[PDB]
Each structure stands twice: as C-alpha cells, then as structure tokens.
Amino acid sequence: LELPADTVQRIAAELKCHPTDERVALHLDEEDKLRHFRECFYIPKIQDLPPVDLSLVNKDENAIYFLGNSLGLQPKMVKTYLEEELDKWAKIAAYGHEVGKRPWITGDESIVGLMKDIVGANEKEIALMNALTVNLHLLMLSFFKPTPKRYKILLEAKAFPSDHYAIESQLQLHGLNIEESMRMIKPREGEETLRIEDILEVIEKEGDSIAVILFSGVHFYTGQHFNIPAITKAGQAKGCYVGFDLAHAVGNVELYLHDWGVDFACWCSYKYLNAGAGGIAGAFIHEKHAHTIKPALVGWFGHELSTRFKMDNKLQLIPGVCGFRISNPPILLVCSLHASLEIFKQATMKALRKKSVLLTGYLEYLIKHNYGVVNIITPSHVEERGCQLTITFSVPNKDVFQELEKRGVVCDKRNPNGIRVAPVPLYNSFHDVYKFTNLLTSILDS
Amino acid sequence: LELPADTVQRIAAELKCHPTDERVALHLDEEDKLRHFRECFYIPKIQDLPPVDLSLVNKDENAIYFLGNSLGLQPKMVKTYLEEELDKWAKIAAYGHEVGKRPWITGDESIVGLMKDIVGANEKEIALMNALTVNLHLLMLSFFKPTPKRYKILLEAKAFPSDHYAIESQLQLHGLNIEESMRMIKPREGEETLRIEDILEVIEKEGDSIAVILFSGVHFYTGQHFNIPAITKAGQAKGCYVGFDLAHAVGNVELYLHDWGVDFACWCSYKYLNAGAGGIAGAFIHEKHAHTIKPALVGWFGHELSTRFKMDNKLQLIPGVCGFRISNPPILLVCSLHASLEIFKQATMKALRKKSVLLTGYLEYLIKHNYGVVNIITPSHVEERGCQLTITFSVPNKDVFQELEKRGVVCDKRNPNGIRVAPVPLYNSFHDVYKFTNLLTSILDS
Numbered sequence: 081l082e083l084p085a086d087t088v089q090r091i092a093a094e095l096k097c098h099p100t101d102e103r104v105a106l107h108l109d110e111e112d113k114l115r116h117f118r119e120c121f122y123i124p125k126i127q128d129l130p131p132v133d134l135s136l137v138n139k140d141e142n143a144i145y146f147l148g149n150s151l152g153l154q155p156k157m158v159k160t161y162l163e164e165e166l167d168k169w170a171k172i173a174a175y176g177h178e179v180g181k182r183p184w185i186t187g188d189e190s191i192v193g194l195m196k197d198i199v200g201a202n203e204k205e206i207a208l209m210n211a212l213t214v215n216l217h218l219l220m221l222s223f224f225k226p227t228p229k230r231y232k233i234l235l236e237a238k239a240f241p242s243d244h245y246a247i248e249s250q251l252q253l254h255g256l257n258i259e260e261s262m263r264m265i266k267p268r269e270g271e272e273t274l275r276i277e278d279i280l281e282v283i284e285k286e287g288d289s290i291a292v293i294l295f296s297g298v299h300f301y302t303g304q305h306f307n308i309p310a311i312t313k314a315g316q317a318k319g320c321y322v323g324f325d326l327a328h329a330v331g332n333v334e335l336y337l338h339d340w341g342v343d344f345a346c347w348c349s350y351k352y353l354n355a356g357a358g359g360i361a362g363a364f365i366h367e368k369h370a371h372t373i374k375p376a377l378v379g380w381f382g383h384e385l386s387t388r389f390k391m392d393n394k395l396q397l398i399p400g401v402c403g404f405r406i407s408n409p410p411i412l413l414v415c416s417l418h419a420s421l422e423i424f425k426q427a428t429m430k431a432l433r434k435k436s437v438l439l440t441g442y443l444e445y446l447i448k449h450n451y452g453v454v455n456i457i458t459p460s461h462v463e464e465r466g467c468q469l470t471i472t473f474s475v476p477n478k479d480v481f482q483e484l485e486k487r488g489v490v491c492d493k494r495n496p497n498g499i500r501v502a503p504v505p506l507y508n509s510f511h512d513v514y515k516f517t518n519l520l521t522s523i524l525d526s
Numbered sequence: 527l528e529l530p531a532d533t534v535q536r537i538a539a540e541l542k543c544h545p546t547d548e549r550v551a552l553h554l555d556e557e558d559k560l561r562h563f564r565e566c567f568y569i570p571k572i573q574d575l576p577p578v579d580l581s582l583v584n585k586d587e588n589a590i591y592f593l594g595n596s597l598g599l600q601p602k603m604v605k606t607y608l609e610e611e612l613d614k615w616a617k618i619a620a621y622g623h624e625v626g627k628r629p630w631i632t633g634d635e636s637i638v639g640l641m642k643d644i645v646g647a648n649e650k651e652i653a654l655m656n657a658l659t660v661n662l663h664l665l666m667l668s669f670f671k672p673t674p675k676r677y678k679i680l681l682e683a684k685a686f687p688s689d690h691y692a693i694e695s696q697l698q699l700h701g702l703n704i705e706e707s708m709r710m711i712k713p714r715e716g717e718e719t720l721r722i723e724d725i726l727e728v729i730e731k732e733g734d735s736i737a738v739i740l741f742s743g744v745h746f747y748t749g750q751h752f753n754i755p756a757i758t759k760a761g762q763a764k765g766c767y768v769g770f771d772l773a774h775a776v777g778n779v780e781l782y783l784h785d786w787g788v789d790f791a792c793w794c795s796y797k798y799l800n801a802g803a804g805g806i807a808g809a810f811i812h813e814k815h816a817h818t819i820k821p822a823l824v825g826w827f828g829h830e831l832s833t834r835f836k837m838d839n840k841l842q843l844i845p846g847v848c849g850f851r852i853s854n855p856p857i858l859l860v861c862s863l864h865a866s867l868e869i870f871k872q873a874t875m876k877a878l879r880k881k882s883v884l885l886t887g888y889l890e891y892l893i894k895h896n897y898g899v900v901n902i903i904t905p906s907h908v909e910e911r912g913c914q915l916t917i918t919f920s921v922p923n924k925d926v927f928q929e930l931e932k933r934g935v936v937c938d939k940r941n942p943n944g945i946r947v948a949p950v951p952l953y954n955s956f957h958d959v960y961k962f963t964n965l966l967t968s969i970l971d972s
C-alpha cells in the first residue's frame with residue numbers, strides 16, 4: 081500500500097509539477113470522493129474569528145479550521161433535528177415520551193445503531209449517556225475492585241487532567257496510597273511519546289499487581305495513537321481489565337472494541353463526533369461482562385423498559401452497559417449527535433480514515449520538505465497517529481501560534497513554542513493543508 | 527389569610543352567582559396578575575393529542591394540560607435561545623467556549639444566578655449539571671459515610687423508584703444489609719400519606735443510628751409536601767445529614783434551602799422548571815460544608831477555572847458543590863433551561879405560589895362540592911401540598927382516566943381508578959380547572 085509521501089510525489093509527476101505545487105492539493109481535492117461532505121458543515125469565515133487581524137487576511141475566505149479534534153464544526157442539520165423535537169414538545173408535550181422518530185424515553189437507543197460501525201460494537205454494548213468523565217467514573221466503580229495483591233491502575237504519564245483526577249479520586253475512594261497505586265508510564269529521556277515495547281514490558285513485569293489499565297486511545301497532546309488491541313491482550317494475559325478513554329479516537333481512527341475484546345471504554349461526542357459543546361457522551365462494555373460486571377450506581381433507567389413504569393420499586397436490571405444508565409436521556413443532546421451520526425453513516429469510517437491518512441500524510445510531507453527548526457512530535461508511522469499532528473518550533477523571535485491565529489488558522493497551542501493541528505476528513509481539504517503550510521513557511525521565514 | 531374556599535364563595539357573592547358558576551372562574555382569571563404568562567408557552571391543541579376522540583371535543587380548543595408536574599410545557603423562547611448558541615457555533619466554533627452571552631466553559635454558571643430565588647440558595651451553593659439521579663449519587667458518595675454505630679438511610683416508603691434504587695445501590699456499595707439499613711417510613715393503616723408527628727418520632731427514636739435522611743420535598747404519587755425545615759432540624763438534632771430530592775418541589779413550592787440549613791439537595795429541570803425531556807439537573811450543598819464535605823468523584827470541571835486549562839494535573843478543587851462538577855456543561859441544555867428561568871424571574875415564586883394555592887384550592891373546592899365516590903389523597907392543609915392533587919374514584923363501571931384523556935385532559939393515572947392532576951400557575955387558568963371539573967362530573971354521572 082502506497083505511503084502518502086509516495087502518492088503526493090507520483091501525483092506531482094503525473095501533473096508535471098513539483099510535489100509542493102498548489103496544483104497537487106487541488107488535484108487531491110478533485111479526486112476526494114468525500115469532498116461533498118464539506119458542504120454539510122458550517123465553516124467559520126476568517127473575518128469573524130476573534131483573534132484575526134483583518135489587514136493580514138482576505139475577507140469572505142473560509143477559516144482554516146484545524147481544531148476539529150477539540151470542538152468539531154456544526155452539522156448544518158442540527159437545527160432541523162432540534163426543531164423536530166421542539167415541534168413535538170409544542171404539539172403533544174408529555175406524549176412525546178412514547179411517540180415519534182425519537183420517543184424521548186428511548187431517545188438514546190433510537191440512535192445508538194449509528195454508533196455500531198464507529199466503535200465496532202453491538203447495540204447492547206453501547207450506551208449514549210451523561211458526559212465523558214462521568215461515564216469513566218461509572219465504569220471504574222464497577223471494574224476497579226482492588227485487593228491486597230492486585231490494586232494498581234496503569235495509565236500514561238501526563239494523561240488528560242480529567243482522567244488523571246478521576247483515577248486519583250477512584251484510588252482515594254479505596255484509601256489507596258496514590259504514589260504506590262497510580263502507575264504512570266513515562267517516556268524515555270529525550271522523547272515525548274511512548275514505545276509500545278516499553279508499555280508491554282511494564283505490563284509483563286507489573287501486570288499481576290494491576291487491577292485496571294486505563295489508557296487513552298489517542299493521546300490528546302502528543303497525538304500518539306496507541307495499539308489498542310496489543311495493550312488489551314497484554315493486560316488481559318496478566319489478569320488486568322483494560323479500558324480506554326477514546327475521546328480523541330472515536331470518529332478519528334477505526335475501532336473494533338468488541339472484536340479486540342476491550343473490556344470497557346468511554347468517549348465524548350463534541351470532538352471528532354461534532355455534536356456540540358458538552359454533548360451527550362458514550363460508554364462501551366464488552367458483552368462478555370453482561371452478567372458478571374454489575375453497575376455500582378443504579379437509577380430507574382437501568383431498569384428494563386417493559387416494567388420500568390410500573391414503579392413497583394422491584395429492580396429488573398438490564399444486562400450490560402444499559403444497566404449503568406441512571407437517568408432519562410436528554411433529547412436535545414440526542415438531536416445534535418444524531419445530525420452528526422447520519423453524516424458519519426454516509427461517509428463511513430473506512431473512507432474517512434483513508435482520507436485522513438493521505439491528508440495528514442500530505443501535511444507531514446509539506447512540513448518535512450520545507451523544514452527538514454520544525455519538529456513533529458507525533459509518531460511518523462501512519463498507523464500510530466490519527467488526524468492530529470503536534471509540532472514544536474525553535475524560533476526565539478516568533479510566537480508561531482499567535483501569528484497563525486491572526487491569519488485565520490484555528491488550532492491549539494502548547495508551550496514553549498508549539499501547536500496541535502488536526503485536519504479532519506469530513507470538512508477539511510487538501511487545499512486547507514496547502515494554505516496552512518504556506519502561511520507557516522511565511523511566518524518562520526519572518 | 528383567607529382560605530381558597532372562602533375566596534371563591536366571597537367572589538361568587540360579589541358576582542351574584544353560585545360558587546360553582548363559570549363566571550367565578552372567568553373572574554379569577556381576569557384578576558390573575560400572572561395571566562399573561564400563559565402566552566409564553568406552547569400549549570397543545572386538543573385535536574393533536576394521540577388519545578383524543580375527535581367526536582367528543584371542540585377542534586382548535588387548547589388541551590387541558592395538567593401534567594406540568596411531569597413534563598412541563600415549552601417556553602416559546604427555547605428555540606430562540608438555542609439559535610443563539612447554534613449561530614455562535616456556526617460563526618466562531620471553538621472560540622464560543624470563551625465568548626458570548628453564554629461562554630460554553632461557564633455555560634452553567636452564566637445562568638445559575640436565576641436559580642437563587644427558586645431554591646433559596648447562593649450562587650456558590652448551586653450547581654447545574656448532569657441528571658437528577660446522577661446528582662443524587664454524586665452527593666450521597668460524599669454525605670453517606672456509614673459506621674458501625676450510624677449506618678442507616680431514612681426515606682419514605684414507596685419513594686420514587688429511581689431514588690429507591692439509588693439508595694439501595696449506595697447501601698450495597700458499603701456491603702450493608704438492605705433490610706436492616708434501608709429505613710422506610712410507612713403510613714398508618716388506612717392512610718396513604720405520612721403524619722409529621724410520626725416522621726419526627728422515627729427520627730427521635732432511631733436518629734442516632736441514621737447517617738442520612740433522604741426525603742422527597744414533594745411526594746410524586748400522594749402530592750404530599752413534607753415540612754422540609756422541620757425534618758431538617760429533627761435529623762440534625764440527632765446528628766444526621768438531611769438531604770432532599772426536590773424533583774416535585776422546585777418551581778412548585780417556595781424553598782429556602784440555605785436559611786433552613788438543609789445539608790444537600792438535588793432536582794430535575796423538566797417538570798415544573800419546563801426545560802424539556804432529560805434536561806440539565808440541579809444540586810445544592812449548603813456552604814457550611816464547603817471545606818469539610820469533599821467530592822468523592824472528581825473531574826477537570828471541579829478544578830478552579832483560573833488554572834484548569836494549564837492542564838498540569840495539579841488539582842485545585844473548587845470548594846462546595848462546584849467541586850462535585852465533573853465534566854464540561856451541555857450548552858444546548860443550558861439554553862432550554864435559561865429560557866424557562868427568565869420566565870420564572872419575571873413571575874417570581876412568591877406570586878406563582880400564591881396563584882397555585884388559589885388555583886389548586888379552587889379545584890379542590892369544586893371537587894368537594896360536586897362529590898363530597900371521589901377521594902382526594904393529597905393533604906388538605908394548604909401548606910402541605912403544591913400544585914398536584916391525587917384523586918381516587920369508586921366507580922366499577924368507569925375508567926375515569928381513559929374518559930378524561932379522550933376529551934383532551936392530560937394527566938397521569940394510578941391504579942385501580944385514580945388520577946394525578948397538577949394545574950400550574952405559569953400556564954394553567956382557573957377556567958381550565960372549571961372545564962376539567964365539569965368534564966369529570968359528566969363522566970362520573972355516566
């Protein structure tokens with residue numbers, strides 16, 4: 081299978097231009113079978129962005145939005161989907177709990193089918209509920225059951241703060257010494273990312289004492305995409321449960337949670353899944369646990385639908401992850417997520433991931449060619465990253481982030497002088513990447 | 527202070543009609559200073575309701591919606607408020623986290639001020655987050671700390687199923703015997719409601735062994751409004767924490783959680799608060815606990831805003847209930863609740879409660895006069911109930927509920943032959959009550 085760099089160079093040869101020519105980007109966009117999906121989203125205009133310097137930009141041009149890994153752009157249909165439910169609420173009020181396209185009682189279940197291909201799990205293995213870190217806790221209350229022999233939680237060092245705090249509070253709940261019980265894998269000296277061989281070594285050596293491995297699927301800062309099946313198998317070989325925070329993985333990289341035998345997972349919906357700030361989150365528990373791992377905290381929405389409304393206070397618990405669902409689901413959040421998931425249905429993760437490899441590969445190619453001063457922290461192997469590249473710079477005189485945002489590039493900063501950029505296949509183009517790299521080159525040359 | 531029955535009879539005398547005359551209802555509506563608020567809501571039309579028999583009703587008449595205690599009607603402004611946020615998301619995407627009327631990061635805090643008068647607490651004592659039963663669990667994980675001496679949870683028998691399951695699972699979490707540890711106050715033989723003297727007796731006699739009292743503020747089925755301050759003081763006198771599920775109280779009866787010294791509380795927003803199915807819920811913790819009662823489960827949104835985004839994994843916990851906030855808040859849910867709370871701001875709980883006393887009092891009066899066969903289960907004392915009356919019937923030949931719903935009355939059923947009705951002051955009229963009672967009379971007379 082042709083690597084992105086090789087595709088770019090071959091296309092350039094065919095076009096009779098240099099691989100760094102704008103025509104290469106324009107051609108890749110012409111050949112992009114997912115090109116039309118860009119029209120499904122509200123893309124901000126450059127002139128409308130708060131930090132933009134109008135004197136450096138062309139009005140009425142679209143922003144170069146590379147922050148879809150943090151706050152995904154809005155599907156145009158969100159309003160329409162919300163209107164369907166507001167209209168029902170206006171027309172029949174309480175009766176909307178039981179009737180319509182999204183009966184409110186089963187609003188979550190009405191759209192969960194659309195998640196099956198995204199995470200690679202069955203409908204009974206997925207719940208759409210609450211918020212990401214909330215779900216992490218609900219799952220950990222059941223999966224983390226420390227003993228004198230097996231009490232550790234294994235995670236990456238410099239994990240996302242919410243997960244870090246969640247794990248710390250879980251350990252504190254059991255009166256466990258944090259320094260001794262919170263095992264955090266640090267990179268080798270002079271590296272920011274983890275080597276799979278090093279992770280597996282820790283698991284092999286310390287696995288007997290580890291109750292739960294809780295890793296990110298994709299690391300938020302380095303952009304490293306961890307080998308989920310390998311970590312899962314290694315942990316399970318030592319008797320650990322293995323779960324993942326897939327905040328940066330879902331809707332980005334392909335996932336097969338069931339087939340890989342992942343024990344549990346959770347994710348948010350407002351990043352690659354484009355559902356809007358604080359949107360309804362997700363949880364997965366492998367069906368193999370449905371009768372053995374029970375919810376720690378129960379509410380009425382974990383009671384089987386068939387008898388729930390008898391209200392006789394005789395719990396009939398739904399097996400598997402839906403037993404962990406505590407409260408009635410927020411229809412308005414279901415609406416916005418639904419609009420997004422219909423788009424994913426049409427695009428397919430297979431096709432999206434294929435475009436992402438070429439799109440991020442093209443970005444990497446242009447960066448490496450022009451400045452090979454500029455360091456890509458994200459792993460170079462195509463299977464070891466998603467959309468996002470994390471880049472650092474060595475320019476004492478320039479704040480590269482500030483100069484980019486003034487010009488309508490929307491991305492994330494980390495210190496001292498670096499950036500997170502994540503071109504996404506649904507609504508970013510190869511031309512976006514071309515434009516970005518030329519703005520960057522111009523900034524670095526002063 | 528004039529009782530509702532006496533107001534009705536006096537008004538009838540002034541009008542020169544019988545207290546049961548339609549003119550009495552029309553006059554009370556003319557004198558209702560809150561009358562205009564009815565126009566702020568989408569009221570369903572009778573012809574649009576699923577169970578309606580069109581041959582028994584007049585088309586284009588409004589439904590008689592008496593289920594505002596279960597699913598509140600929609601403020602007309604909900605769509606407008608949602609559009610503000612969708613428009614921001616479309617225009618500036620990620621930048622919406624920090625700017626606008628409702629910066630997404632502080633979306634909850636941007637509207638919490640509007641809850642101050644509703645629950646009678648300070649802004650630092652209220653959090654808008656998650657869902658009701660979820661919040662109940664988050665609070666109980668911190669407030670319920672059983673010991674060999676003090677391990678019981680005290681609640682009413684036949685509590686709402688979700689609360690019942692929550693309490694059961696909390697006890698199971700600590701390995702406590704449910705039958706011994708879950709103390710449930712049952713009514714006297716031949717009664718459905720609880721006597722305050724009986725509740726206080728249990729507290730006095732068993733209080734030393736009770737860790738937490740968790741009562742509803744208003745009981746969902748009987749409509750009994752419990753004396754919150756009296757239960758709070760009695761529990762605290764015995765060293766118990768006292769908390770309330772205010773699902774049926776908030777936006778219905780007046781509340782002074784801080785001044786009463788209530789330890790903690792939680793509530794939903796889709797009942798009297800009209801926020802839409804599964805809307806963003808609420809939690810209260812008295813400020814007296816801010817430095818002593820810490821969250822059991824922590825996430826990044828419990829970390830002080832000023833340093834949260836440094837992402838250095840060094841927790842700086844917000845004192846009080848906001849420390850219990852785990853995840854970033856759902857803006858779309860904030861929108862719908864905000865639309866409702868602006869209406870409550872204009873109306874005031876004081877004025878709403880005053881109308882409710884007269885409105886429910888008038889309903890009771892008409893029921894008692896025509897059939898004094900018909901039993902009101904809800905306490906008769908005006909201070910011992912909210913909007914809702916629960917009514918039972920003794921007619922072997924008639925399903926009263928089915929006959930009411932066919933005629934465009936929207937209410938709730940319980941067996942064998944009874945109903946829950948809750949005329950609400952924001953959008954129900956005295957004429958609604960008059961019409962309802964005449965439909966009921968006609969049904970009962972066969």
Ligand SMILES: *Cc1c(COP(=O)(O)O)cnc(C)c1O
Nearest residue numbers: 407408658659686688746773794
């Ligand atoms: C309506 C109600 C609930 C509903 O629970 P959710 O968590 O909102 O699904 C719970 N408890 C009481 C007392 C209620 O009246």
Ligand SMILES: *Cc1c(COP(=O)(O)O)cnc(C)c1O
Nearest residue numbers: 212213240242300327348853854
């Ligand atoms: C974005 C993200 C979160 C956000 O937490 P919320 O519960 O949604 O507020 C948590 N963990 C990871 C790994 C994330 O990337």
Ligand SMILES: O=C(O)CNC(=O)c1cccc(O)c1
Nearest residue numbers: 149150151300623630631854
């Ligand atoms: O983008 C990330 O990796 C993590 N950050 C967020 O999810 C985020 C950023 C700003 C506001 C917010 O609520 C969440």
Ligand SMILES: O=C(O)CNC(=O)c1cccc(O)c1
Nearest residue numbers: 177184185408595596597746
């Ligand atoms: O109305 C009550 O007292 C309790 N019921 C609900 O809150 C309710 C009813 C139907 C659907 C739902 O999600 C909640």
